[PDB]
């Protein structure tokens, strides 16, 4: 049988969780930036990031189904103890990083929805109910959650689809932007945003989810007829799930690039006064450009297209916040299960991630204002960017060795493509790390920064060397 909807339906379910794992509030903010910084021109990189991410997903599905152990478990059996644990903490930092920008995303959504009545720190404390929810599920132990993901995608698409219809962007521009890569006259900050988007799309821990989710399904490893079909249908399920997420992502970028591109602060202030929305003093009266964030972007969108659009945007962010949390605990539970072989319930994982995440976030909210609160999102975005490759070297390093993947190793073209990719990502990171070091130019603060940079480069180079032997 070439293809059958019956086999698809019987082998679905990993795509549902994978889809929502690709729309964390970090990604929405990442797609938000291109809407007012680069417009439609920087849209093709989104497709390239998704396409590479999908190609990485198929490797996660291959590794997950070829051997019963997921990628975290097989990581425990390959690297030495010191590289294992240091990698273990490195990937963990992504989950705390992922949960950190989520609570900023959720808190901002509360503040916009509450017309400023509920304060910022109120939003930060309002996500503790998410932890309370996770405890309640653990007591009940439903353990299915597939309807939650399906509904969560449904509200996401409906909310952002309403945004796309209301904005009504020109289909010519988005088609010309997506299918024709063009990006000229850019400096280091522009490519810095470019690497930010590709890092934000390919989240490092999504490989662990797919490996574990594929492992859940039962399949005869020894017999070669079951694994090939299971691999094919899981790959096609990833393609559908990734296509839906990318369609939603292109919805947001096209929405924010149509009307919020090249608009000075005077014009948006003028329309805000005409609409008489109370949130009008945020934009200063000057000739300078417009800067967009979750708080500001929702405000101007509400000014331009009524409070209805703002509230729908706030709801959409909240759905993203819930999605990032659910994939956050799922990622954290599986990695700790595999790497150091520790069994912890989901309630333990969310409590650890949330309690660590809200400690700085509530403090900066009390001390600094909301503009700096979204300013911290820059720090998380770049930190996630330097640690983006840690999802690349491990996946092919492990899905390249003959003993571990049996005779289902990747073809020659896949190996050379990965080798080019890791070299490209290594060169980009070493290019950026020296620039970030030069930014400070201190005497001893540069020393500790240099020591950290030396350690991270040594880890990255060792993984790269391991990949080269593997390939």
């Amino acid at each position: 049988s070439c293809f059958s909807f019956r086999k698809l339906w019987a082998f679905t379910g990993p795509g549902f969780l994978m889809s929502i794992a690709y729309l964390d509030p970090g990604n929405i903010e990442s797609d938000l930036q291109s809407g007012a910084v680069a417009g439609f021109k920087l849209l093709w990189i989104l497709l390239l990031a998704t396409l590479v991410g999908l190609l990485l997903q198929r490797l996660a599905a291959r590794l997950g189904v070829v051997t019963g152990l997921h990628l975290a478990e097989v990581c425990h059996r390959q690297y030495p103890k010191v590289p294992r644990v240091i990698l273990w903490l490195m990937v963990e930092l992504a989950i705390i990083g992922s949960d950190m920008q989520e609570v900023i995303g959720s808190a901002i959504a509360i503040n916009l929805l509450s017309v400023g009545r509920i304060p910022l720190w109120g939003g930060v404390l309002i996500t503790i109910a998410d932890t309370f929810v996770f405890l309640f599920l653990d007591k009940y132990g439903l353990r299915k959650l597939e309807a939650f993901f399906g509904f969560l995608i449904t509200i996401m698409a409906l909310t952002f689809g309403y945004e796309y219809v209301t904005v009504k962007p020109s289909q010519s521009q988005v088609l010309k932007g997506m299918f024709v890569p063009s990006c000229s006259g850019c400096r280091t900050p522009q490519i810095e945003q470019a690497v930010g988007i590709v890092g934000a799309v390919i989240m490092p821990h999504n490989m662990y989810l797919h490996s574990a989710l594929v492992k859940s399904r039962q399949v005869n490893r020894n017999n070669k007829q079951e694994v090939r079909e299971a691999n094919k249908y899981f790959f096609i399920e990833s393609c559908i799930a990734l296509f839906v997420s990318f369609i939603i992502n292109v919805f947001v970028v096209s929405v924010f690039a149509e009307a919020f591109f090249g608009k000075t602060n005077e014009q948006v202030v003028e329309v805000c006064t005409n609409t008489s929305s109370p949130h009008a003093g945020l934009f200063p009266k000057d000739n300078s450009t417009l800067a967009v964030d979750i708080y500001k972007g929702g405000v101007v969108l509400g000014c331009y297209f009524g409070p209805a659009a703002l509230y729908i945007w706030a709801v959409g962010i909240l759905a993203a916040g819930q999605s990032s949390t659910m994939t956050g605990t799922y990622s954290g539970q599986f990695v700790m299960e595999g790497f150091l072989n520790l069994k912890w319930s989901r309630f333990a994982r969310v409590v650890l991630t949330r309690s660590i995440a809200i400690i700085p976030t509530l403090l900066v909210a009390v001390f600094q204002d909301v503009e700096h609160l979204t300013g911290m999102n820059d720090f998380l975005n770049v930190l996630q960017s330097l640690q983006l490759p840690f999802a690349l070297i491990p996946i092919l390093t492990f899905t390249s060795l003959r003993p571990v993947m049996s005779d289902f190793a990747n073809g020659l073209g896949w190996r050379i493509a990965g080798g080019i990719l890791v070299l490209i990502i290594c060169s980009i990171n070493m290019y950026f790390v020296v620039v970030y070091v030069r930014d400070l130019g201190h005497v001893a603060l540069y020393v500790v920064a240099a020591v950290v940079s030396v350690a991270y480069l040594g880890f990255v180079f060792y993984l790269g060397w391991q990949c080269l032997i593997a390939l």
Partner: nanobody
Amino acid sequence: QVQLVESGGGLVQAGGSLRLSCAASGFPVSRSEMYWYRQAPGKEREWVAAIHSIGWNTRYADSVKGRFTISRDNAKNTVYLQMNSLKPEDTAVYYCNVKDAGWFWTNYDYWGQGTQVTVS
């Protein structure tokens, strides 16, 4: 369909200041890169500066940095140069050019009508 008209030509003494404008219509100039040129008498056309606007970045040529400033008003669909401390070597025919990639592998160049600027 592409149209560009330059306004702000004339005679100015060395060390003066003046503001030049390219006004264009028929396309969304806000979304497209904007380049600027000057053709000195007896010399070839040369890259002066351009507002690519992918991040509202402004790039200047070597003999231009620190002396000329650029701005744009997409509301008026127009671009402005403010030139200060004009030196006698600045004498040239000034032209406004739009580089529409065409979403293909070849670009198309459209020039304005050309304004003459004189420096003593």
